[PDB]
Design a protein around this ligand. Structure first.
Ligand code: HPA
Ligand code: HPA
Ligand code: HPA
Lengths: 283, 283, 283
């Protein structure tokens, strides 16, 4: 199923009938960072399998829901259960939910993820406001926009110069200052590793020479689809470990340690994004 | 349809019957740089959709023709309407027209494209004679030759050390000196970004560290297929903008500005390649 | 055919019935480096086409056998006829034979390959014990593990920090010292170029800046599948040429010169790995 104007409209038609919510804000949370989706007020949970033209996620399994409701007086739509390209999903399957968000009226997309630190200033438990990215799949002919262009959503050759909104980064940093955890908040360039293997010690060493501050396996496809159709983006990475430090000390990297860091920071991140949603500018 | 010896021969059989032209030179022009195809003498225009085994281009749309005729006393065949890999075409679809050119008797392939400047010495409106390339799709298992090797056309492991002919670069530079626009002609290494998104500011910064002078979204697949079967190549990039300058000044990159640069330089490039064709060495 | 637990078991069932050999060691040899497969004692040769669920190799042609028997008192299984990803094989086709090796009881995998030298200390005819790798296909969303994870074999996010066993590298180096050819044995980082084109002179220059010592077109997919399911790996590259030297002197790179180097070093490499197999630690 192509993520075109007609197929995305069929999905939005179903969502509009099931919930009265017309959201202005979209949210995609990383694994273990989705507790905020539980406190959505007046919420409607729609499984992916019930939405027309939504991608099939049975092979991977686990949760896959679209949740719509209110947070701090704001109408939002949240993706519960993230689609990652290392699972084998095509460009069309990744793009359709974001373009359905666009047809529902989403103008701001807030994204969180887990990732590894490359810049020696980044430690486990730090946050990174993403101000730019280095897209290795895109350079190697695996860009999420490879294929025919859907002209109703955006241009054939998008400009990514301002994909990460400056004013949204300033707002997130100010809220961190107001609550005195600005000592955990950095800015940096995000490198897209397709995955699913963690970067080898020598791959981390290469990313250090290339100017990468953070490396992860997601986010960049969603940001490009959102920037393509004109949706503002705020992207925040939670640093689970510094792979340059781990290479020097021969310390292993595994998913159990990563999720433990997510649990250590889940509540603080939930409070942070709840206030960001509340403080998002109006018209 | 595989771009094998049998399928390419079926296409060449049709072309040979429709036109008496046996071309020695092949031409592929970038968007907005194809006015020379309008001045082909005694020309025959063959739409792609009429040629057996030629790739289907209806989804992308727009012009797609094979034009055969004479330029300056030389017999040429021109591709009007370029096939780009960011559109979703497979390796086989890209390769077949060049291998059909080979079966028609083409020995020299002349290519132009639009691209962005990385080397700080490159300005908008400059020309770059490509003397080498850095193929990011090829390194990441998306090389145009990935798949079974068609032994009738070339070897399994081609050498790209001399893919860009030295004597053809010298000839193009001499013609520029004879007409006093050598101050616009540079040499450089071409980086292949799969596209279709323009390079982010940080991706341009990485390409500067990697030694890339120019970055674009085409040409390298055609050069590899041509070098595979023994066709000499001359490749010229027209610099639409310097993305390193644009990153420092936060200036946007879009296709409208790119085509305006192509229109600014179209006539000069048409005169240039008309003389290159005329001056190409004989046997 | 997916390389899952059920399909690999069907292949192992057939292999177990055809040969009484329960191997503990697996071997994959590069082109021209497989003479050791001829001296397997009490050996059984099983063509790939006869094994259920084994990938189809008729399009590429040439030899494709699984050989099981004894070397120096050790029970081994050898892949005769290597599957390379530049041929067009999918992730599932590459992975299945290694996962069948795992189900047969293989705990150590020994791999050899031909490659080009980047580090200026590497000359033609040298050996390189691979201690790490830089996987460009993996970074660009062409990792061999992209797709659904087969949980019976390994985790979703594997750690590659110790994919190349330290103790196996020490053993191979000691045997080289015992026979006085340690002056040919180096250590280095292996870069994975998808192929099938040899690296351009500028691509070799980039790999020099990125810290790559060796570049080749294989091995890394097999190492990742083996590390995924817990198989120890020893990987040795034979340097056919130094492409940085060849770029400075404009010397061509072709497969005929590469195979001549393999023939020059075949017997020494056969003696080397025969002793490595004999000296592999017991329980
Ligand atoms: O090192 C890592 N840690 C956590 N997440 C990651 N995603 C890519 N690399 C890493
Ligand atoms: O910056 C650019 N400008 C014009 N063409 C391009 N192709 C890739 N990047 C660019
Ligand atoms: O330069 C080379 N020589 C031999 N094998 C190779 N594999 C990749 N590059 C090379």
């Amino acid at each position: 199923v192509v993520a075109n104007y007609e197929n995305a409209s069929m999905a939005a038609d179903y969502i509009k009938r099931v919930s009265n919510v017309l959201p202005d804000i979209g949210i995609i949370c990383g694994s273990g960072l989705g507790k905020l989706i539980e406190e959505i007020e007046e919420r409607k949970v729609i499984p992916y399998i019930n939405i027309p033209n939504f991608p099939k996620t049975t092979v991977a399994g686990h949760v896959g829901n679209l949740v719509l409701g209110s947070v701090g007086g704001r109408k939002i739509v949240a993706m519960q259960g993230r689609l990652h390209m290392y699972e084998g999903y095509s460009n069309q399957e990744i793009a359709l939910p974001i373009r359905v968000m666009k047809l529902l009226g989403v103008r701001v997309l807030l994204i969180t993820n887990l990732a590894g630190g490359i810049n020696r200033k980044l430690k486990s438990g730090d946050f990174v406001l993403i101000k730019g990215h280095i897209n290795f799949p895109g350079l190697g002919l695996n860009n999420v926009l490879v294929g025919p262009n859907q002209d109703e959503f955006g241009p054939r050759f998008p400009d990514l110069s301002n994909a990460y909104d400056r004013l949204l980064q300033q707002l997130a940093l100010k809220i961190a200052q107001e609550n005195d955890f600005q000592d955990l908040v950095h800015e940096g360039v995000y490198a897209f590793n397709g995955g699913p293997t963690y970067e080898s010690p020598d791959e981390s060493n290469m990313l250090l020479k290339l100017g990468c501050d953070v490396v992860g396996m997601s986010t960049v496809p969603e940001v490009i689809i959102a920037c393509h159709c004109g949706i503002k983006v705020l992207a925040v990475s939670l640093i689970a470990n510094n792979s340059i430090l781990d290479a020097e000390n021969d310390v292993s990297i595994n998913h159990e340690k990563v999720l433990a860091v997510a649990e250590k920071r889940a509540d603080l991140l939930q409070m942070w994004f709840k206030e960001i949603i509340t403080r998002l500018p109006l018209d």
